[model samples]
Target chain A: TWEPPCELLDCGTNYLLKFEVPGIDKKSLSLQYSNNWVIVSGNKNMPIDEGDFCFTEILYGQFRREVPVPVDASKDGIKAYYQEGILYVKLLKVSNSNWVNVEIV
Target chain B: TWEPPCELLDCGTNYLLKFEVPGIDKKSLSLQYSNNWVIVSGNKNMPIDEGDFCFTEILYGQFRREVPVPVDASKDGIKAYYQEGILYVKLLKVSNSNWVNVEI
Candidate 1:
C-alpha cells in the first residue's frame, strides 16, 4: 500500500484535511469516517507502459490513510471534494468535542 | 541536497528526459548539459507555517539530478519545458552514436 502526503489544519471550531492525489479521478477516491478518525482510501489508477523505466517517482496502486479528526466531528457536517490534484475535507463543527457515528462514504 | 526522480528515453536518433516536480515555478528550475551528462537542479519553494503540523509529508528542499545523454548529443540540440508539474527535456540527436566534446 502507498501513503499519500497529507496535512491537517486546526480551524478553531472546524477542521480541514488535505492530501496530494494528482492524476486520480474523483470517483476513484473513497472517503470514510469512524469514531475520531477520517479514512482516506483509493487506487491511484495510474497507467504506465510495461517495460523497464529509466526512472519512476510517481506513487501508484492502493493507498489508505486514517487521520484523527476533531472529537467534535459530525457525520453530516463533513464535506469532501477533489480539486486540481488535492483532496480537501472540511469537518464542520456542530458542537464541542463529541462522538458522532459516520460509516463509509 | 535531494535527488528527484528522472527518466531518460531513447527516441530513435534523439532522446527525452522527464522529472516530476510539482508546485515549483519554472524560474526556480535550472537545467545544464555537459559531456554526455544532463544536470537538473532546483529548489522547491514550498511555503508552510512555522507551528507544528498535524500531518506533513511533502518534500521541500533543494534537488538535483544528472542524466546521461546520448553520446552524439549536441550542445544546441537540447530543449526543455515545464508542463503541469513535470519537467520535460528533449535531447535531439544531430547524428549517430559518437562522443562529441560537450563540456560546460
Candidate 2:
C-alpha cells in the first residue's frame, strides 16, 4: 500500500522504469537523480509537446527470480540487458569464468 | 626418450590417444584400455597403409603435467576436449570442495 508518490518495485530490491521521450527519435537513455534518491532516465531529447512532454513506457517491471546468467559462478559475474520492454540481468555466473585457470609448467 | 616397440605408449595406462581411423569417420573410436598412465592412440582403426595413415599428428607428446582435472577433485573432476588438433580439458572442482584443515 503506497500513496500518491508510490513507485513500482522490481524482482527484488531494484527498480526499473522505462519510457521513450516522444519526438526524440531514438537516442540513448540514461539514469537521472534527485534529492532523496536517483532515477534511471534516458532520452537524447524528444521535442516537448506543448510542454506536456511525450514519453512512451518502454519497460517498467522485472522478474521475481534471479534469472540465469551465462557464465561461471566464481568470476566474470552476471550481465544485464535492456531492450524494447525487456530488462534482463543474468543472476548466474558467466561461462568460461576460468578461461585462464590453466597452470602450465 | 624411449624405443620404438616401446609401443606408441598411451597403452591404457590412461594415456589418451586420438587419431582418425580411415573408415571410423568420427563415431566410436576404439579405446584400447585405461589406468595408471595416460596415453594417446587415435586411429579409427589400425588398418594397413592401403589405408596410408594420413597421420594427423594431433599430440605427438603432451607435457606430462599433472593437470588439474575439473571434476569434483575429491571423487570425480576434470573435463577434457580435443578438436582440430586442439585438446582441451576442464579440471573444474565441482563447487563444494570444502576446505577442511588437517591438523598434524
Candidate 3:
C-alpha cells in the first residue's frame, strides 16, 4: 500500500483539497465525505504483472488518505473533480452555528 | 526540482525503463540517451498557483531522472512511449563486441 501526497488550501469561502495520484483508472477510485473528514481511497496496478525487475521503485496497490476540515464547512455544497490523475475536492464554508452532519454523495 | 520514481526491467533481449510522472504535459517531456545512461526530464506546474495553501505536500516544477543501462545496449533499437503519465522506454540489447558509440 501507498499513500499519495495531498494539499489543502483555504480559499476565503471554500476549502480545497488536492491529491496526487498518477496512472490510476477512474473506476478504481473511491471517495467519501463525512463528519468534517474527506476520505480518499484508490488502487493502482502494475503495468506488467510478471517480469524480471532489475531495479524497482514504483509502488502499486491500495492507497488511502483522510483530510480534516473545519467544523464550519458545509457538506451540501461540496464539489469534487478528478483530472489528469489529480483529485480536487472543494467544500464551501458556512457561518451557520448549527452543526448538521450529512454525507457527501 | 524533484525526481520521479523509476523502474528497470531486464527482458532478456531488451531493457525496459518506467518513470512515474503525473499531470505533466507531453510537450514538457525531454529524453536523451548517451553512452550507457538515459536522461529523462520534465516539468509539472501547479494547477492553481495563486492561492493560500493551508497544507502542501505535492511537488511541482522541473524533474529529472537518469537510468543506467548495460554497455551492450544498442541505441539504434530504442523506443519510447508515454501513456497515462508513465513513460516507457525500451532499449534492445546487442552482442556486437565492437565498441561503437552513437547518439540514441
Candidate 4:
C-alpha cells in the first residue's frame, strides 16, 4: 500500500525487474501492458508427489519468489518474456505523470 | 550486419538497455529508442592512471558486448534507466519484422 511514484523507485527512476522461476513448465506467459499497476507471482502449483521422479523435482527444488516492478510504463510500451528459467519484463515510465519534467514553471 | 527492419527503427518502439560504465562520474546518460532495437555502450573515458581509483575500478572493469533485441514494439512505448551496477533492459519485440513473429 503506497503512492507508487512517491515510493517505488530505484536509483532515482523506477525499475525493470527480472526473476528466475523454477518448476511447473509453462509454454508461455503473456503480459498485456496498461497504465494500471501489475503483478507477476510465482508459486508451487505442484505437490510433493506428482513430479516426484522428474529430475528437477527429485532434488526437491521448488523455489518461488515475486518482485515489484514500478508502474511507470506507458499504456503501449510494456513487454514481457519468459525463457529457460528466467522471466524478463520491462518497466516503462508512464507518460504525463509527475515524471515528465514540468518545464521549471 | 543486416538491414534494420527494411530500414532503421523509429527509436521509440525499439529498446531500453542499461549498462554500468564503471568509471568517470556522470550525472546521467541519454537514450533514444524506436522499433525494438537498442545499442547501449559503455566505454572507459579515462586513461590507465587517473580514473583507476573509482571504487568500480580495479576489477579491470572494461567490457563491451552487444545483444540484439527482437524488433517489434509499438510507438509511444519506450524508455531506459540504469542503477546499482546492474544494467537492466527491456526488449520490446517489434511489430513489423516478419522475422519477429514467425514463431520459429
Q: Among these predicted structures, which one has the highest lDDT?
A: 3
Model 2 misplaced regions, further than 4 Å: A1-105, B1-25, B28-36, B44-75, B93-104
Model 3: per-residue Cα lDDT over B25-91, one tens digit each: 6798999999999999989877565368887888888998888887878888899988766788999
Q: A46 in model 1: Cα distance from truth in Å?
A: 6.3
C-alpha displacement of A66 in model 1, angstroms? 2.9
lDDT of 4 by residue, B61-97 (tens): 2343444444354445455544433244544434654
Q: What is the CAPRI rating of model 4's predicted complex?
A: incorrect
Candidate 3 CAPRI level: medium
For candidate 2, write residues B1-104 as lDDT tens digits: 11101111121112222221122223432222123232333333332322222222222221222221212222334334544322322222235536756889
Candidate 1: residue pairs that collide: none
For model 4, report DockQ: 0.02
- Order by DockQ, highest first: 3, 1, 4, 2
Candidate 3, residue B38: Cα displacement in angstroms equals 0.8
Better of 3 and 4 by TM-score: 3
| Best of the two (1, 4) by DockQ | 1
- Residue A104 error for model 4, in Å? 24
Off by over 4 Å in 3: A11-14, A48-50, A93-105, B11-14, B48-50, B95-104
Among the numbered candidates, top TM-score falls to 3
DockQ score for candidate 3: 0.53
Model 1 CAPRI rating: acceptable
lDDT of 3 by residue, A26-92 (tens): 7989988998899999998765653588887878899999888877788898998886667889899
Best candidate according to DockQ:
3
lDDT of 2 by residue, A1-105 (tens): 101111122323223222212212223433333322333333333213212212222222221211111222322233344432223222332234445686889
Q: What is the DockQ of each candidate?
A: 0.29, 0.01, 0.53, 0.02
